[PDB]
Design a protein around this ligand. Structure first.
Ligand SMILES: N[C@@H](Cc1c[nH]c[nH+]1)C(=O)O
Ligand SMILES: N[C@@H](Cc1c[nH]c[nH+]1)C(=O)O
Lengths: 420, 420
């Protein structure tokens, strides 16, 4: 009856392997930059995400799998990694390690989204974090690291986008501006936008429908860029200076509305055309003050995260494939009932240095050979009356059909030299 | 304010590395036996565990983190892997793949346990599964694989325990027997046991408290083993035949009650008496009929699972340590403020082929050298006014004190040949 809940799926085969390659590469680039692997629990106290992600965001308000612990306490399935990372930083007194502290991890993230496929309720992302410093070098580094993780995978058609949200103060003033300009024209907004006009009006910029877009155009709504505090623009220029020097091709966006509310200053995203909507492979930005929201001291930080599934799609789009699932080095086929157990014993003597499998029931040579082929085995191994009594095994390389009869002892060596 | 919820913890450093070594080894032994890696979602429809694990078990009744889908459906955080594996087997029509289908995975498991340390609410286990066959060779194989996963890690002091729970008929009769012997003495049972006496009385055997143990002793309660039917007895003997042949030292237990209700016939566990209570490193058994409980056809199966944390403790107990975390190949120390950014740029030119790190602020040579040493760096790199204007870098192997001044171009090669 039961199936895997919509939005989640079993990972195996080529799909699983691609994910592993992706995380493997991310591990290499991130750790070369000094990042330490830190894996946080699957769930945190619901407050870590409420306060952290901001009580006004879609995620917190209606997209988190939150439940209650038997007796008391509210727990929530991690929807994103940054807040948890900061929570960990705080808890482990990382403030005392030599700064900045770079952390990275790869794991599942959960988001309660309205059922109708949509996309994913359980997805996986690589998360990088640089904590303990306001230096714009880290922002540039974070952007380069994300860019390189994808670049190393073989992706070529990426679109880096950079911008800034100024600071909570600048963010506030821009919102006020939006209300003042939009409210008297409130009646020309999409129902969706009319709600967004209440909390975090900026979203109305990144909304769909023609109603909104045409209005914004005629009203001459000015870009979030025009509201950056000077220190903010100084910082952003430093980041651009570094990226240009590192030759990272980017485009400065008029405004980058990120789905989380802890962002301050730098904000970036890397896209890929070949995905359709949800072209974002990953993104990130600075988030000083988040630690304070979780009740800690001031701890500056920048980082990014990217969706493994998204990256996989991008790879597929660029024609990157994976080679066929390897079969067993040897597949033992018993010719008599007594032989089935002997095949098992022989297989055990060969493992784990050699991948040896066997049939659990006797069968004709041709049939068992058919099954060995069916399993992609390199060698077929026959165990009938003769070899059982002689303490030998009849091996047959399936590719050429070449056959060899040798003692059980030589088998490991013969196979290893013939395949290694 | 927030901490990692009791029963969960952040994995990093040596602790994380041990887990990876453990899973790495398990991967090798399991995949050599033909196991395919299959990772199931973090949560399943609550029914998969209710019906699967059995509605009478402690796990289902009061130890599962269950919550409601943002729109109805009851979802539950996976407390164990077998049911999910069978669910996957059913869903993907693996029944049409060549049998038996061997699957393995390593991941987090969640159990809502009463807060007071109590060990773990989120732990990790390696799970092996062999589906599609009643053959006792698979049971022996499952036992040998679990044994070998631990054996390969270096563990020597393991205690393998084997037993059987018979067939549904034998299981029923033993339960009846338990009721008949225990009911008239019902008043001497622990409150917990008095409930278990209603559905699946066998649990009362594997319960805690002295109140139960002493009673069972004086009453002369007979082992589940004496109640095995003929076919069950035959199957178990086959398993012992195989284990003895493979020289796997085991002890036949009178009654090895396991923690789940889907078990039928073979049941085994490997313990280590140097962890205190909870000496079970892992265990498993056969579970035909589970697929049917999930609404599928009859699919026989055996498997095991072991706690990575438990195994880690066992390793520690046997004195197995982890060495030194590698430091960066190069640690660039800026001598002027202008140099910090240059160090970053240089570091970026060297990565990811080389692990290069740098200080984010200028410092005196001696100080930066001490920091390079603290970080376990192979080479220290100086960037002061001289080298900045000359387009060079002053390298110093911290080991031999050998100092070299070379051009930025000569750096990647020199470092690679000096460390590769
Ligand atoms: N966690 C953010 C990305 C991020 C990581 N660090 C900073 N921002 C996301 O879910 O997109
Ligand atoms: N599911 C079992 C392990 C197992 C695998 N196969 C049969 N049993 C456990 O949680 O201990």
């Amino acid at each position: 009856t039961a199936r895997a809940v919509r939005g989640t799926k079993d990972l195996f085969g080529k799909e699983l392997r691609m994910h592993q390659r992706i995380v493997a590469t991310a591990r290499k680039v991130l750790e070369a930059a000094g990042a330490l692997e830190l894996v946080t629990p699957i769930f945190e106290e619901t407050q870590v995400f409420e306060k952290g992600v901001g009580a006004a965001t879609d995620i917190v308000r209606k997209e988190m799998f939150t439940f209650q612990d038997r007796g008391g306490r509210s727990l929530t399935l991690r929807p994103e990694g940054t807040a948890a990372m900061v929570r960990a930083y705080l808890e482990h007194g990382m403030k005392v390690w030599p700064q900045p502290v770079r952390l990275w991890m790869a794991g599942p993230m959960f988001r309660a989204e309205r059922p109708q496929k949509g996309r994913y309720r359980q997805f996986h992302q690589v998360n990088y974090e640089a904590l303990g410093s306001e230096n714009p070098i880290l922002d540039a580094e974070a952007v380069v690291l994300l860019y390189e993780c994808l670049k190393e995978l073989g992706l070529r058609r990426l679109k880096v986008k950079l911008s800034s949200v100024g600071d909570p103060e600048d963010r506030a003033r821009y919102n006020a501006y939006l209300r003042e300009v939009l409210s008297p024209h409130r009646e020309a907004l999409s129902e969706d936008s009319k709600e967004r006009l209440e909390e975090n009006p900026m979203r109305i910029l990144d909304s769909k429908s023609e109603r909104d877009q045409a209005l914004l155009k005629e009203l001459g709504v000015r870009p979030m860029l025009d509201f950056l505090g000077e220190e903010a623009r100084a910082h952003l220029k430093e980041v651009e200076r570094h990226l240009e020097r590192l030759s990272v091709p980017y485009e400065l966006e008029p405004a980058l509305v990120r789905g989380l509310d802890y962002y301050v200053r730098t904000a970036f995203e890397v896209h890929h055309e070949e995905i359709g909507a949800q072209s974002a492979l990953g993104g990130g930005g600075r988030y000083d003050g988040l630690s304070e929201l979780l009740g800690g001291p001031r701890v500056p930080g920048v980082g990014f995260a990217f969706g493994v599934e998204r990256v996989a799609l991008a790879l597929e789009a660029e024609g990157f494939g994976l080679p066929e699932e390897k079969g067993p080095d040897l597949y033992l086929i018993p010719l008599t009932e007594e032989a089935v157990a002997e095949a098992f014993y022989l297989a055990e003597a060969l493992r784990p240095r050699l991948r040896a499998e066997y049939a659990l029931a006797p069968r004709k040579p041709a049939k068992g050979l058919e099954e060995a082929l069916k399993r992609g085995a390199a060698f077929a191994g026959f165990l009938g009356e003769d070899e059982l009594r002689a303490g030998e095994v009849t091996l047959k390389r399936l590719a050429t059909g070449e056959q060899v009869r040798l003692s059980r002892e030589e088998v490991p060596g013969y196979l290893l030299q013939a395949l290694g």
